Amino acid sequence: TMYICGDSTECSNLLLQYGSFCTQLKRALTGIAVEQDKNTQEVFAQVKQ
């Protein structure tokens, strides 16, 4: 809601009915961000000693 209408309230008011569309976009990026830390952990942290 910052990238699309941004500071325009009148615009934001008609972005509300999309709703789940913004959720899908946030959810997908969040999943990627988490995976990136998992990848690092799997490669380097072979030994906990």
Partner: protein
């Protein structure tokens, strides 16, 4: 705010990126350049003849 973002009355354990539900009234400002040209209504209404 987190509960609204996730569309739920219960939130799990973890760190969440939330949406901006904060509102402020803001100001309203209009600016124009100096008006110095005027208009010669003096020669029309203040005519000596």
């Amino acid at each position: 705010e987190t509960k609204c973002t996730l569309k739920s009355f219960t939130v799990e354990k973890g760190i969440y990126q939330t949406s901006n539900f904060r509102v402020q009234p803001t100001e309203s400002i209009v600016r124009f350049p100096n008006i110095t040209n005027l208009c010669p209504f003096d020669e029309v209404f203040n005519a000596t003849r």
